[PDB]
């Protein structure tokens, strides 16, 4: 196993997870199986307690593991899946000695950070890494490790004095480390002392970095890279500079061109792993993939605007796997696309009262979109706006995909507005009111990768000739409700056919509405199954249906 | 004896000088006598030796120190005078100790960093805070330290510790620290890391701050300040937002707005300093002249264009003092200031066959302006360049003063194109070829401040008449050459009159040429006595030749 | 050049110099040439001001330098000969680059303590690394340096920073670091976490140690060991167990039994270095001679008691070149040393008066003693007591060496006490009393390597005898005054002949009394140039004529 640590820095946020993809990527393009961990410093077991406000968007595993943001970066990057081990939390490795000691596992010794945490770490990484994570049962050839918070904080501390006795317990040329740091630029000088603080922590902590990752406002200048190479033990070709670019597809072409594959090759000895011609073909195949969709980026022109319907749009990282899967089927219809960012709230009348700037910019933006979704969103608050906009797609045949509470909010629709029953509702909203045209049910979270399988009668669907017309459908679940199974047949009676259903039929997945060019609506969130090269179904024809070529795209998939 | 320590930051270059002369200019608006000593960390004695390529010009006190830029910042601030001892270095203060050990003045013992040199550094600091800085003969009641480079690095390890005794050789109340640190803002986001890292070298050395001066590129959102006021143990009202502003007269209103005078009033118990009504009427009576020129700088509109003819003009900070007296006389004028910044070699006609570019950018500049200085350079390799612009001014009737150098350029050029011997030159450009018509002649620096007096014949000049026709002018010097007083009499028979002199009479010290509008040149540098509110004669002389209402101007100088 | 840097630890005192010296000297074993350097991170330009109530006595150089106590423990552990420039002070180094920045050689650029004087710091080590210190004009093959202090200190972060770049600056595998460190033992258990806390500021300051040699009061138990091991990345090899031990020239052969010299020859390719099988023998051959001392220091028996007449007899180090002198004596006699210090001022009658206890004690020990050293002490106020110890060995023909002021008080005492002038003095305690029998009289000290030479009727004379009869001994001064040449032939008249002199025959160097077994005095300090395996002749001649076989001597020195 080769280890590859991503670190630390000046500041939190810095692009150590964009870094981390980059490189893992990278090496995979000379053929090699690469797996990924993230440690996170917080206390936290798994992230499906925390609510989107911090960290962003909570990630759903096929395991049903609600975890870390990072760990869909790898899942998208990579090619690859992971399960709930491959996210370490203080909370995880501490709640595993403490429950290890109960029992007695430690034959009466004190157990102390070091050496029982801090091997308690080292046993989990190897453990883990060596977890398949392919298509194939191969063990992984690399694993890449984000070091999560900053280097020098006391949460910190138990992680990076195991990743120094690592770096030990494994041999070198295993094991290196690259560093993300933050260069200022003040007065048109760039400020090398905040780097040079961030060197010395990780002196004093016991470790050497092999990479220093700049990120900047600019090109380093090269004079600016001598002084860093003065500073740290490092040569010039050890100093990547990483600016702000306006595109995230681009940065693994930037190291590419500033020899980091080169330099890794030679630093971690990996033209020593044994690899067929079969596997140094795949990674090439990998990199011209990658080159192909980065020019397609660059030379196309013509837009494509989305309207992302749904509450706190301003923090644009709680839907940020929404946001990738939108841009990936954007890049394969080659069209720029703008997501148009709408709050469901602002589009309720009442805003009008409250204040009509925002009441006013929300329908301007779901008026010039050329698509629409409905994201999949988290408390039931913002749901008489999300019915209007569903209500608006359906009226007017403009293109439309609803996620989770986006075939909700639909049927809820449908059922008050093409049914005729005014009330009817969202169960999660109003409960004890008891009103009778439940539209949700309850049928104890229903988590993770299971099956849907498509109805008989459905073959005529968009939403079934995007699925290749396969039997089943596997995606991933974080769901409490469904839709009620009594409203079902006269919903059907009415054209709003639920095409696709859990295997003992009680459970409502997916419908496509009769008639409407494109009116689609998944239980499941596609979101977390989207790859870089392969975009998700529901989003592909979405961003298809809103620029045309719907038939064009549904042709190129029955090949 | 009060002190302020102005220190540290997680970069070099963030704003302790404007931050340490505001503090200064602001508590003297409660009346009280403020000095100033900058600490610089380097090893050089003093900075003559150091060309302005590093740290921006050496400033020249009266003394003849040629001493650190930060010293220039303070006399102009506060409106003090200060000696080669205010500014402290590493190589003084080890030097002093070296001395003083090999003629025995510590008795036989073992001289150790702490406690004797961290103790003769203690010793400067109360020697040098009750030297007189003002007009009147009373010793000071605050010093500013400014603490240069950063907190943390091994150059500054002896002044921490030193300032660590000496908040206790010295009472609490008797000092305060403030801190300056940079927030960074990346992706919308205002990155708190840094200035915690910051605190804990503090911590780790010893010192806790009394105000954190927060430097960013926005307001500081108030969420925060709030965690800048949880991580290190201060209230709210002790961090100062001190964001990126146009320009830096503003900053005394920005920290008095911020209650930083209430604050410190509070922290060093000032009010239980003595002081009489008419110090307290001195120190408002500063602070409504503050809020006049800065009120007649933002609603100011007409604009002025000087010509700053000279090399390194893309490192500004070469400049610093002449821009300074360029902008407080631009003030007193009510004109905003545009400085066009011409390199002299460029102007000459090669640079046509070098890059046109380069070329027409200087001439362009140069028939743009309203005035024109040349502003007393270093090393002759322009003066063919300055030779052009000196004859442009003279053959068009264009505004001009000349600097030190600027005498010399303007005398040969006036020698090779109005007497007419076409060879005529600087000494210290040609020496060994010797040429008969040496315009330059050596008269072993002539140094810091000395007296010049006007030649009799010459009420006349506008030069004399700005000066308010007083007898003597006591002006800086920093030259080594003279005008040849062979060629004085065949200039004057030919208009270019030496209308001021050294009591000696060898040696020539203004001009005034008789009939255009304003051609004078000073062998001293009058930047070096400019002040906020009183700017530097000739340069105030330049801006109102330049604007129209030199005879206005004249007339108020008068009274 | 290889470098090994013996440093810092938990408390200074530790034994550095003691480890440094068997370095150097195990080193030696191989037959490569050995130098070495000390640090000291003390201001003092040398400690020739410096009182010996700090660190022990000054040491005299051939140059003159009066250098650190190290330098002597270096010149007799290893046979080598070393200038003022082998001891580095921080006044030295500071003083060395500010002299360098008023002359202009840094050419204008701001001078840093990083890089420029810690390359002064590297710059040095080479220049002086190179010189030649054994009786061949090679340059040496090793430099040994210790770090004075402790590692972490303010003083020694300049230091510490240079070593940080000399591991780089010159190859790895041509540097090597031991770092000495305190293991204390509490309730019969040996603590590690001081030497822990040790390896962390290593790290912090960004070296690495090849070595701890950990300095213990028992021999280390081997789970200590294993812990130190695990602590430190070094195998349980390179921990060197270096407990308190009642001799110092056995230290070798601990680091010999454990495997120092095998584990540095893989450590520093030592294998490499070019030797002849000449220098192969002269290895061993020292080894040998050393295990030879060693055996002869151990199965001894027969005791000599030596007194030590002096000032401070209880800081020992202010004798430590003498104390060493005569163990070399007595090592080359095969009799156990017992030096019986003796407080001169307590063998004045007046002490009965004050404290009968310290009178007694020094007269039953000044009766005991079979031979007499009066040791060239500093400061006049006990030369009354010390003329009672030279006229008590005079008049009872017990063994006399008097040195430097050893001459003085026995010329003084013979004057008083043999020619009957009974108030005849050192002027030096008198000065302007202007009595007309000035015994002492000033001759502006005469300082280092000088040539005496025997006057001619003094064959007969034992001193000229144990000096191999050679026409001129060549021996380190530092003194101020002379015997008066006037007192000369009035003294020689009652023989008490000066059997030699300076060339010019002014000065006064060596005497012997006529028919006393041994009454010698010398001007210059034989100490210093007293070597393990040949000691200084002077005080072989005391201990040989305290042991009898002063006559078995002479013959084995005349072959
Ligand atoms: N080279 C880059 N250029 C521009 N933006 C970048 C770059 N690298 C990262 N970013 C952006 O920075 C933001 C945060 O980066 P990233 O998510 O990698 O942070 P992090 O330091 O790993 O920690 P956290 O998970 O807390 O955000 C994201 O919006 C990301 O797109
Ligand atoms: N509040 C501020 N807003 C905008 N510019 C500022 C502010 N404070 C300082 N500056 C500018 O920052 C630059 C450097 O500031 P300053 O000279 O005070 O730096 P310093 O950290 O004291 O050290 P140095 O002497 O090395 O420059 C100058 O151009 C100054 O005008
Ligand atoms: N292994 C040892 N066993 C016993 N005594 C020792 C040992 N090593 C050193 N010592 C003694 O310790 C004392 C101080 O040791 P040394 O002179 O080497 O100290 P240091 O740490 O180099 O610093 P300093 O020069 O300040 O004394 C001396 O008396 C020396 O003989
Ligand atoms: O105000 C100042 C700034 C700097 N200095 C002295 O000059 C040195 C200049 O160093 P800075 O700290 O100004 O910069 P740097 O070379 O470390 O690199 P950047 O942060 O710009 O990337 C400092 O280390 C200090 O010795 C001062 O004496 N005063
Ligand atoms: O990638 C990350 C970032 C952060 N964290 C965890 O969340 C915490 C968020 O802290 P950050 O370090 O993200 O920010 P902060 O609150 O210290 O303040 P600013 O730098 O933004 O001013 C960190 O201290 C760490 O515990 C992670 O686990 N992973
Ligand atoms: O009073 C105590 C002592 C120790 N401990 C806990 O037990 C551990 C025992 O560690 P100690 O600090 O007692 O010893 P050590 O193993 O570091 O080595 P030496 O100093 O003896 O050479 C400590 O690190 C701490 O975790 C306590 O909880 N309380
Ligand atoms: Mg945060
Ligand atoms: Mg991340
Ligand atoms: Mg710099
Ligand atoms: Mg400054
Ligand atoms: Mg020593
Ligand atoms: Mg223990």
Known sequence: MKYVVVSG?????????????????????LGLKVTSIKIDPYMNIDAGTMSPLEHGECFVLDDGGETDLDLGNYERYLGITLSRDHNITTGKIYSHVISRERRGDYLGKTVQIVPHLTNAIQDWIQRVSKIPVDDTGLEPDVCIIELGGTVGDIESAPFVEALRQFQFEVGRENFALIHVSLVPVIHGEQKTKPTQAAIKDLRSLGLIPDMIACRCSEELNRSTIDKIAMFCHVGPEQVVNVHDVNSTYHVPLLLLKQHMIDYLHSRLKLGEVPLTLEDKERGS???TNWENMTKNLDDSDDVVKIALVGKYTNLKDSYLSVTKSLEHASMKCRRQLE????????????????????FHDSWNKLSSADGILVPGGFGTRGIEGMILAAKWARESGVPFLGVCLGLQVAAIEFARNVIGRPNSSSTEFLDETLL?????????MRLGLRPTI?????????????????????????????????????????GFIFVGKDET????????????????????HPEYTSKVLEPSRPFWGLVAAASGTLGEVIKDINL
Chains 1, 2, 3 share one sequence.
């Open 505 to 524: 039929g009680q459970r409502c997945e997916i419908f496509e509405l009769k008639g409407h060019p494109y009116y689609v609506g998944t239980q499941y």
């Open 454 to 494: 498509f109805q008989p009668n459905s073959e005529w669907s968009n939403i079934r000739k995007l699925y290749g017309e396969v039997n089943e459908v596997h995606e991933r679940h974080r769901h409490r409700y469904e839709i009620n199974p009594k409203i079902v047949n006269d919903m059907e009676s009415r």
């Open 9 to 29: 820095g000046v500041i939190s946020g810095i692009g150590k997870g964009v870094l981390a993809s980059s490189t893992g990527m990278l090496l995979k393009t």
């Open 339 to 358: 997501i148009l960012w709408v709050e469901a709230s602002n589009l309720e009348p009442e805003t009008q009262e409250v204040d009509k700037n925002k």
């Open 285 to 287: 195949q990998l990199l």
């Open 436 to 444: 009778a045209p439940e539209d949700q049910v309850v049928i104890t």
